[PDB]
Amino acid sequence: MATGQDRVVALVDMDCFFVQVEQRQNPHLRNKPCAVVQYKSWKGGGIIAVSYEARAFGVTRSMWADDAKKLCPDLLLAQVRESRGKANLTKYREASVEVMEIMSRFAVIERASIDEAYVDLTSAVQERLQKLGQPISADLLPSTYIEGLPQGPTVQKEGMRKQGLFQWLDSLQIDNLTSPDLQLTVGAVIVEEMRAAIERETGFQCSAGISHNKVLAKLACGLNKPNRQTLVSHGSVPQLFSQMPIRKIRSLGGKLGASVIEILGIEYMGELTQFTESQLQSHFGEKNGSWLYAMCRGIEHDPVKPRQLPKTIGCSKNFPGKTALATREQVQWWLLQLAQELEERLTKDRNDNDRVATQLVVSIRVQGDKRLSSLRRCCALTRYDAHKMSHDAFTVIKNCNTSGIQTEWSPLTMLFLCATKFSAS
DNA sequence: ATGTGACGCT
DNA sequence: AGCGTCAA
Numbered sequence: 348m349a350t351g352q353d354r355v356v357a358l359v360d361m362d363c364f365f366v367q368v369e370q371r372q373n374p375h376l377r378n379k380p381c382a383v384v385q386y387k388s389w390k391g392g393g394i395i396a397v398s399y400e401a402r403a404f405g406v407t408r409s410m411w412a413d414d415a416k417k418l419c420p421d422l423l424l425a426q427v428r429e430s431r432g433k434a435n436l437t438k439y440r441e442a443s444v445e446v447m448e449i450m451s452r453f454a455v456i457e458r459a460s461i462d463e464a465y466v467d468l469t470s471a472v473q474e475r476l477q478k479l480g481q482p483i484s485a486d487l488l489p490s491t492y493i494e495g496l497p498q499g500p501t502v503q504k505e506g507m508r509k510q511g512l513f514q515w516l517d518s519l520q521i522d523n524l525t526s527p528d529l530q531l532t533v534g535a536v537i538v539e540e541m542r543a544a545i546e547r548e549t550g551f552q553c554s555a556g557i558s559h560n561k562v563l564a565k566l567a568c569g570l571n572k573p574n575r576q577t578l579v580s581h582g583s584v585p586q587l588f589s590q591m592p593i594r595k596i597r598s599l600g601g602k603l604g605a606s607v608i609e610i611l612g613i614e615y616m617g618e619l620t621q622f623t624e625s626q627l628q629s630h631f632g633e634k635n636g637s638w639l640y641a642m643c644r645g646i647e648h649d650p651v652k653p654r655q656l657p658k659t660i661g662c663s664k665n666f667p668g669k670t671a672l673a674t675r676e677q678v679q680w681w682l683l684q685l686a687q688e689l690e691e692r693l694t695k696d697r698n699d700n701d702r703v704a705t706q707l708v709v710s711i712r713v714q715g716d717k718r719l720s721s722l723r724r725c726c727a728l729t730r731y732d733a734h735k736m737s738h739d740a741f742t743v744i745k746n747c748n749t750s751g752i753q754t755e756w757s758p759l760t761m762l763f764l765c766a767t768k769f770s771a772s
Numbered sequence: 773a774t775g776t777g778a779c780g781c782t
Numbered sequence: 783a784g785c786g787t788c789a790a
């Protein structure tokens with residue numbers, strides 16, 4: 348029996364992260380229907396983050412502020428810092444590197460997103476079981492939800508959870524330390540603990556998902572939001588997946604999952620457990636078949652990586668519709684500004700992490716082209732110089748102008764510089 | 773006309 | 783090397 352209960356993986360996401368960061372800075376926005384805005388010019392600005400009070404009005408990410416004011420009239424709005432013509436997210440990066448430092452103190456983290464990190468707690472948990480030859484109280488888990496529980500023979504929201512917790516806390520075997528359920532339970536305490544520190548030392552709230560692998564830890568987190576954690580066990584999986592849409596799983600949100608639906612003619616994840624391993628390999632490849640077969644039975648061996656630091660530093664600028672760049676001088680100018688921000692971020696990164704980028708990546712967009720990026724060329728980053736970068740960034744794309752006149756440009760919907768291929772310093 | 777970053781594939 | 787997929 349290849350348990351599928353080898354590791355203990357947690358996943359922590361900050362609840363309406365960007366909003367909180369503003370709410371902490373501006374006290375007047377806390378416990379208020381509010382949102383983070385970007386570029387007031389076009390339609391009051393596009394929304395990139397929504398407080399959960401404003402999520403009651405139906406305000407969502409990717410929506411113009413003017414339109415959201417029609418749903419939530421008294422929607423308080425914070426604005427994003429702007430840098431040389433573009434939005435600047437230095438505040439949330441600096442606010443993110445805060446939380447990572449804290450999660451690091453407990454265990455090794457994989458920076459999935461800016462407000463997310465994965466934690467492999469196998470080592471840490473076992474090193475607690477020896478120091479705790481004794482039961483586990485419910486008071487050590489005041490925000491933990493046991494998925495699937497309760498059931499059988501407690502009316503409102505926190506009325507339950509308690510029962511599901513109690514029903515669970517009885518069933519577990521504190522005697523058997525190899526008991527995977529016991530491990531997750533202990534991890535949840537450890538997760539509860541680090542969460543409390545995050546809120547104490549930053550003032551920020553977050554949800555967490557605890558399970559045996561990364562993908563389940565992900566889904567578990569999003570189950571009970573906000574400021575709650577959810578424990579998904581091996582036993583919760585079959586009953587859970589049977590009603591759980593496939594689109595609601597990492598990687599399966601894309602067109603892969605779309606085909607998987609219409610190819611096999613299904614809806615939920617539990618319906619994959621029928622098909623053999625070789626069948627799913629026959630449709631989606633040896634890699635996907637092996638993965639889907641394991642994952643539909645709640646198994647995934649994609650490991651948590653010691654990667655608290657990114658591998659690519661980049662900044663983008665989009666020029667939608669008639670705002671496209673049709674001169675060499677606009678392009679020359681913007682590439683500079685883009686390279687200017689990239690430089691100070693690089694010199695920053697260097698002074699903190701003691702490392703340097705070596706290869707400059709340039710990427711563009713044209714009009715009448717759907718895909719996010721059309722062309723993309725590497726360079727060679729040797730000097731953190733906002734000019735040498737952009738000048739070379741121009742050089743590696745100077746040819747792209749299809750105009751007979753050199754002063755113009757034929758046009759760009761987007762530009763994207765990216766410093767990568769790092770090296771130790 | 774919403775506006776980074778990681779990874780797989782050829 | 784360049785492009786495609788996926789998600790925050």
Ligand SMILES: Nc1ccn([C@H]2C[C@H](O)[C@@H](COP(=O)(O)OP(=O)(O)OP(=O)(O)O)O2)c(=O)n1
Binds near residue numbers: 362364461462572790
């Ligand atoms: N397409 C996106 C996705 C995220 N973010 C920013 C804003 C988010 O606050 C933060 C993380 O977004 P999440 O998807 O993790 O979810 P939220 O933090 O917005 O709230 P919640 O966790 O309650 O869903 O990164 C963004 O600007 N654009």
Ligand SMILES: [Ca+2]
Binds near residue numbers: 360361362363364462
């Ligand atoms: Ca979030």
